[model samples]
Target chain A: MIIDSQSVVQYTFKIDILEKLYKFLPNLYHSIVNELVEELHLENNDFLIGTYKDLSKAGYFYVIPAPGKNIDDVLKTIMIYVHDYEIEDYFELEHHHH
Target chain B: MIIDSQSVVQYTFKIDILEKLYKFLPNLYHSIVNELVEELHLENNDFLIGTYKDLSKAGYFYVIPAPGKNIDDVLKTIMIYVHDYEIEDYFELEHHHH
Candidate 1:
């Protein structure tokens, strides 16, 4: 996907796909909290900066930034973690409706 | 993307792609907040359920559920909003790093 250089650090997701994600990755949220708290040394309050949405679309994501941490660096750490799990493969998979 | 039917109502995102998203849709967060507050008639405290991550991957998303709002219905509304803007098109676009 295209990157918006002018924007601040954030994540985005389609509401539809997001539903499927919850189903696929049941423990997704807890996992992130663990990493930030354990490895990144971030407190519960700092990791979850806030949540936002695209006014023009049915999409949203969160901002997680810690004090003394570079936003890009934090994002990179998270991305590396995602790559290790091959999560991107799920994004490339075909969807099935029932 | 393949969806997990067994999971709960939530969203997911790759940390890498998420960064790109922030750049692409700068006002995305505010947009979502507006819709939930204005159209869905949700309060600020309730719209943001929480944030989570996959212990296995560098992925995470939020859960927005109001007291009386059906989770699936809330998701559908957001998805419809996303479709209106064709934000998914950005996901289909190629990325270039500077």
Candidate 2:
């Protein structure tokens, strides 16, 4: 359902109690994607998910968000919202090779 | 240090965690991978990290887990035992393209 108008965003965010999800992981997938689709009124199936700065698998950490127009804004707003959540399990997945 | 017998796994685990990670986030990285290294006895420089089914990044949610020999055992056991730990913050990162 992905269209050219959306961005395939793959950035990181912090996970918390409300986010880890219950049920099998697929439920998590549906919960998130569905929520975003309704809340944001998204109309597509092409999206990306990952964490910010996980370093397992040789520096691999991932999380899930969603694809939309102005992906940068989406990422920024998500990060900002996560910050506002004031959860103890917040992390940043900035990109750098230093 | 990653040997062939070990799986280069990247899965999505539920993170109701003792796991969303604190500190810039690297702390979570160090904690999980480091503990896995010590407890699971990992010795490798190659691996892949991801989540079960984050559905972000165009259906790309990611998580981190270390690689080791008898990788299937590790994956099954992790999934099984994660079931045991009773942490609501856990999720599974299975693989499929359907």
Candidate 3:
């Protein structure tokens, strides 16, 4: 994704794959660790300041669906936190759908 | 990408080797195996329905940017758990002439 002042950020997704993610999550009630947010720290704000900002807080906080500016900042904050609670399916999904 | 209601979900990106991957995900750190939240569970939510209310979790999810409700509503109240991982340079640098 390229983020610029003129352009916020542009992303591409496989229509089919995306349809799937939308179906999952928000429904289930169990494990969910790895995702673009978890993969990059966009969800953790502190993780974005620097490689060590996480130093500010390490008490293990709870993840909330709560979306707001802090949530919105997430879009601009992280360079690329592009996925949901899934695998390294970046390629698998990004492919063939073409 | 500043996702607004009027705006669906416009993303920005810099053209690279045309790599579907990032030529991506390199991260400032090494990427470890992110096991799809161990839950995109083929089966899944409805605790909020009547009996169980296991309705808002990520049990092995398959998430994609759903523009929220105006790109909001990040339920699955147990919501999600973000991580401390880093995405590759995704780009060489946010370069400047300074």
TM-score to native of every candidate shown:
0.25, 0.20, 0.18
Which run of 10 residues does model 3 chain A get worst, by summed lDDT? Answer: A58-67
Query: All predictions: root-mean-square deviation over Cα?
Result: 20.7, 21.6, 22.0
Tens digits of lDDT, candidate 3, A16-40: 3333433443222112322433444
TM-score of 2: 0.20
- Model 2: reference contacts kept, as a fraction: 0.00
For model 2, the stretches where C-alpha displacement exceeds 4 angstroms are: A1-47, A51-68, A88-98, B1-98
The local distance difference test score of each candidate is: 0.38, 0.33, 0.26
Kindly list the per-residue Cα lDDT of model 1 for residues B37-86, writing each as its tens digit: 24432322223332233333321334434234465564455445434545
Report the C-alpha lDDT of model 1 over A4-96, residue by residue, as the tens digit. Answer: 112123333223443344455536633643453244323222333222333333223343342234655644554454345454466555455
Fnat, model by model in order, equals: 0.00, 0.00, 0.15
Say which candidate scores most in lDDT: 1
Among all windows of 10 consecutive residues in model 1 chain A, the one with the lowest summed lDDT is A1-10
Share of the reference A-B contacts seen in candidate 3: 0.15
Best TM-score among the predictions, by candidate number: 1
Query: Model 3 over residues B7-98: C-alpha lDDT tens digits?
Result: 22322222222222223343321122123222211111111100111222211222223222221222232133222223223345534422
* Model 1 regions lying over 4 Å from their true place: A1-98, B1-20, B23-61, B91-98
Give the higher-lDDT candidate: 1 or 2: 1
In the range A5-47, model 2's lDDT, one tens digit per residue, is 2222233333333243322243543455345423322322222
